[PDB]
Structure formats: C-alpha cells, structure tokens
C-alpha cells in the first residue's frame with residue numbers, strides 16, 4: 007500500500023531499568039553458552055508493583071508520544087493496544103483503560119492480537135480507519151505493553167530465538183502532518199505457520215493451572231514434526247521477502263536508500279540473520295539497541311524508531327524501514343521518510 | 349457513518365447443544381429465583397472435546413458463512429476474530445488458525461478484544477480496511493468464538509445480567525455485493541466505565557492461580573463505589589442512545605421502520621429493558637431467540653441475524669438494527685437492509 011496522506015506524529019517508549027545477562031548467568035537463570043549465542047546483553051525488567059502493569063506503562067508511553075507530537079488528545083479517533091501476554095486483570099478491556107488514561111472518554115479502543123507483529127499490523131488497520139471517514143479526528147494512538155512474570159514466562163529461556171523485555175511503546179499516526187511520512191506499508195503472511203506457535207499443545211477447556219513454564223522453542227519443533235512441510239524454512243523466507251519487496255516498491259525506495267531498519271529483537275547467533283535476508287549490514291539495523299532491551303512484546307519497532315529519533319541518528323531526507331514479524335506467521339513492514347526532527 | 353458500498357455477503361453460527369436453566373436449577377447450579385428473574389430459558393454448551401475449542405467452532409461457522417455468500421476464499425483480504433476469553437492454547441495466534449482453516453495461507457488475520465462489542469466493532473474496522481486499497485480482495489471474514497469453563501467461569505452466575513453460551517459466529521462483509529446492504533454504522537463510547545469491568549481487582553504480575561470463580565456482578569458494584577460518579581447510569585444510557593440515534597439517521601431510517609433489532613442477550617427482569625431505550629417492543633427484538641442461546645461471547649449480533657435470515661423472519665426491503673454493547677464501555681450499532689434472501 008502506498009499512502010498519500012499518512013504521517014507519524016509522535017513515538018515513545020516507557021521502559022523499566024536494564025537487567026544484565028551477566029547477572030542472569032551468575033544467578034543460574036541463564037546458561038552462559040546461550041547468553042553468548044543470542045547476543046542479548048540486557049533486557050528491561052519492571053517491578054511487580056501495580057504502577058508497572060502493562061496498561062499503565064502503555065498509558066505513560068502514550069502520553070509521551072502524544073506530547074512529543076503536539077497532538078491534542080481530543081483529535082484522536084482510535085486507540086489500538088497490542089500485546090503478547092497478561093495485562094494484569096482478566097475479563098477486562100485493557101485497551102479502554104489505556105484510552106481513558108491517555109486520550110479520554112469518547113474514543114473507540116480495541117485490544118489487538120497479532121503476536122510479535124501487532125505494533126506493525128496496527129499501523130495498517132489504523133491507517134485504513136483514519137482514511138475511511140468513520141471518525142472525526144485526524145490521529146490514531148497505537149500502543150503496546152507487556153510485563154512478563156513466572157511461573158508461565160521465563161524471560162531468559164521461554165523462546166529460543168530471543169529474550170523478553172518488559173515495557174510499553176506508543177506511536178501516533180496522523181492524516182494531517184508529523185515528523186515522518188509513512189510512504190508505504192505491506193504485509194506478508196503465511197497462516198500455515200500457526201502450527202509452529204502451538205506445537206502439539208492440546209486445546210484445553212480452561213487455562214492449565216498451575217502454569218507450567220512456557221517453552222515456545224520446543225513448540226516450534228513439535229510443530230515442524232507435525233506439519234511435515236517440505237519447504238518450511240522457505241515459507242518463512244518468502245513471506246518476509248514479500249513484505250520487504252512490496253513495502254520498498256510501494257515506497258519507490260531501494261534497500262540501498264534505507265538509512266536504518268528497525269527490526270524485531272531476535273537472533274540466531276550463527277549463519278544468516280534477518281539483516282542478511284533484508285540485504286543490509288548489522289550496523290544499519292536496530293540490533294545495537296534491541297540487544298540492550300530484549301524483545302519488548304509487540305513494541306520493538308515503535309521503541310527502535312523512538313531510539314533513532316531521540317538520539318538524532320537520522321536527519322531529514324533519510325528513509326527508515328520498520329520491519330515486523332510475528333507468530334502466525336505475519337509480517338508488516340513500513341517505509342517512513344524523515345521530514346523534520348521533533 | 350453512512351456506507352456507500354458495504355454489504356453482508358453471508359452470516360452463520362456454529363452452536364453446540366442447548367442446556368436448560370431448569371436442568372441447571374435441578375442440578376444445584378442456578379438459584380430458582382435467579383432463573384425466574386433473568387428469564388433465560390436455555391444456554392448453548394459445548395463439549396470439552398478439542399474439536400469444540402473456540403477457534404475450531406469459529407472455522408466451521410466461517411465455512412458455513414462463506415458458502416452461503418458464494419464468496420471465493422481468494423477474495424478475502426482480512427480476517428478479524430473477536431472473543432471474550434481463552435481460546436484453548438495460550439501464546440498462540442488463534443486468528444491465524446481461523447484464517448488458515450476457513451480462508452487460507454495468505455490473508456492477514458488479527459485477534460480483536462472489545463469485550464461483548466467485538467463483533468460489531470469489527471464491522472467498522474473491516475469496512476475501513478476493505479475501502480482503503482491495502483488488499484486486492486473485496487471481502488472480510490469476521491468471526492467470534494468462545495467456550496466458557498470452570499473454575500474461572502460459571503456460565504449461570506458469573507455475570508449478573510446474563511448467562512453465557514458457548515459457540516461461534518461468522519459474518520462475511522463485501523464491498524461488491526451481498527444479500528444485505530450495510531447502510532450505516534455508529535459507535536458510542538465512554539471509557540470511564542472501564543472501571544466497572546475491573547472493580548477493585550488489583551493488577552497482578554501473573555494470572556491468579558488457582559482461578560477463583562469470576563463474579564462480574566460484584567466487580568460492577570465495587571467499581572461503581574471506587575468511581576463515585578453521580579451520573580454513572582446516565583453515561584451508560586447516553587452512549588447507547590447516541591449509538592442508536594446516529595446509526596438510524598446515517599441510514600435515513602426511523603425506528604418504526606426497523607423490522608427487527610438484534611440485541612445483546614441480557615435481562616434485568618424488572619423495570620426497563622434495552623428495548624424501552626431503543627423505543628421498540630420486545631417482540632421486534634431478538635430476545636425470544638437470545639433467551640434460548642445465552643450470551644454467545646461477542647457473537648450475539650451475528651447469530652441473531654443468522655437466525656432471522658435462516659428462518660425467513662425478514663423479507664427483502666426490511667431494515668434490521670444490529671446493536672452492540674460491551675464492557676469498556678463501547679457500543680457499535682448498524683442498520684442493515686435486506687436486498688434478497690440467500
């Protein structure tokens with residue numbers, strides 16, 4: 007999709023303090039071989055206090071993003087809140103709380119689930135909503151927020167390719183103006199790969215209690231065994247290449263003209279990484295940042311973009327690729343152009 | 349929102365067998381006074397078999413609805429799966445499963461959370477998406493699915509105003525054509541009421557285990573206390589009346605020209621009921637049906653419209669009000685004109 011009139015108005019993260027892989031190793035929580043392989047130096051870890059519940063961190067990130075963009079909350083016509091895990095209270099609309107605390111009473115709010123790709127997928131859904139004429143305001147607030155805790159989640163081991171960081175991020179879209187223009191978005195998807203996110207886990211009538219520690223790495227292997235697909239790895243590669251090619255093509259931009267790519271925090275640690283598929287070096291991705299925060303739920307792309315802008319690592323005229331990807335498997339990519347610095 | 353080119357192509361519900369309130373009374377699960385007051389005659393109840401997990405019930409409803417509209421799955425550009433509760437397997441994209449099984453590999457799929465309003469809210473989000481140019485296809489598949497189970501959920505008592513039913517529904521939208529035309533949608537919202545859905549439940553770092561039985565009636569009472577607003581009931585009434593008024597006038601339709609209203613399954617039992625606020629009699633709403641299914645997660649409106657169409661209880665030219673409402677609080681309403689009978 008080529009967007010004629012869509013902008014990023016503001017972007018911000020609220021992240022708790024850093025917790026080092028070195029301390030995790032010394033506490034016996036993380037095998038040193040694994041620490042070295044995955045290359046994550048630290049992840050962000052929140053206290054267990056109510057004030058650090060995901061919807062409260064999201065509310066803080068949202069207020070920072072709206073303030074930095076100078077967007078009036080009364081001009082926000084939609085709130086989308088994406089997440090991976092528990093928001094702190096069940097049977098309750100976390101999205102309406104985020105909306106209420108950051109924007110106000112009379113804005114439609116949805117919770118959005120597209121696993122790790124939620125932040126990026128939200129941009130397409132919101133962009134469409136803003137162009138439709140359904141609501142009066144010109145802006146949409148997109149938030150993410152998670153806070154991982156045991157027993158269910160072991161942030162250091164529960165996923166093979168990454169380590170979870172706690173925190174929230176926010177991005178404000180506008181059809182009027184912003185510091186960056188969204189030139190394009192594009193989604194590659196292959197829903198056959200959903201089996202890798204459940205493995206051989208049975209469908210249970212109720213959440214299994216007490217919660218065993220999650221092991222999504224073992225799910226992918228039971229999943230691969232079960233699927234019996236000849237081209238499993240090719241399916242992943244193809245959907246990622248389609249998102250990239252179409253986002254770039256619809257933006258009229260080549261990969262050589264991408265100043266920086268903001269990517270999911272994940273790492274194989276040997277062989278080809280995502281940057282090799284994208285066709286650009288490691289230093290032109292957000293990895294140097296991402297490896298200090300870990301995988302902050304659905305917010306890596308918003309957080310990484312905030313990092314670029316806050317540290318003046320881009321200037322007007324640069325184009326940036328925001329690149330998604332999440333279990334499903336769904337990948338939404340976007341090309342943005344820096345128009346001015348906040 | 350007046351819609352120039354939005355149609356309903358097919359609608360279906362996959363419902364498990366009914367279970368009577370009176371059998372529940374005799375089993376010591378429901379107080380006789382409550383069964384009489386609420387007037388719910390029966391509720392749908394799924395088996396605990398894996399084949400009745402919500403996303404699987406949703407896939408079958410989706411297949412049924414896609415067949416009734418003769419929609420080629422290659423023309424579906426979006427799947428939105430809305431739900432209230434656990435989908436059977438955690439940390440997994442249920443929407444991608446629904447999409448894969450009902451439509452295919454290469455359609456973007458999102459999970460949606462807007463409590464009981466998810467089904468109706470999804471119509472606006474999907475309408476915008478189809479109108480935007482993002483996907484080539486002309487149709488969106490919208491599903492719902494839930495299957496309630498203990499200890500967390502007591503279908504008979506966990507919500508004071510209704511009793512939960514298991515099952516799934518599906519609604520296929522199209523910008524090209526269908527058996528019904530969507531003339532309008534309108535959302536009223538007041539996010540201050542999110543507190544009623546949370547009560548004084550503290551934000552916990554991890555799901556509380558073992559799960560106690562949910563009591564959402566008590567959350568409302570505790571929430572109202574904490575909120576201490578003098579006009580709480582007026583806020584609720586006002587957003588419902590605003591949803592109603594705007595839907596009706598964007599469709600250029602007066603209330604006495606609405607043949608039927610499909611409403612959420614609930615009942616106070618004395619005093620006014622929603623039909624008084626809508627300004628139409630009880631027999632021109634879906635209550636006679638709804639009172640046999642219970643509140644079927646986010647799918648009451650889809651199911652109620654399916655019941656109308658399948659039993660030829662509406663004819664070409666009739667206009668139907670579909671009326672949402674979910675904790676948040678958000679209410680999305682729509683006026684639909686029947687163009688022909690499938």
Ligand SMILES: *SCCNC(=O)CCNC(=O)[C@H](O)C(C)(C)COP(=O)(O)OP(=O)(O)OC[C@H]1O[C@@H](n2cnc3c(N)ncnc32)[C@H](O)[C@@H]1OP(=O)(O)O
Pocket residue numbers: 463464465544568580581584585616618619620621622623624625673674675676677
């Ligand atoms: S996922 C969906 C979950 N469900 C919800 O989120 C429901 C949210 N709302 C509530 O829980 C509130 O408690 C509401 C419904 C706002 C208030 O309910 P009450 O029944 O406690 O309201 P009051 O007793 O204050 O009623 C006073 C008078 O207000 C009118 N009125 C209230 N509710 C309705 C409805 N549903 N329909 C028509 N009129 C309504 C009545 O005139 C009422 O006087 P009565 O003499 O009781 O009729």
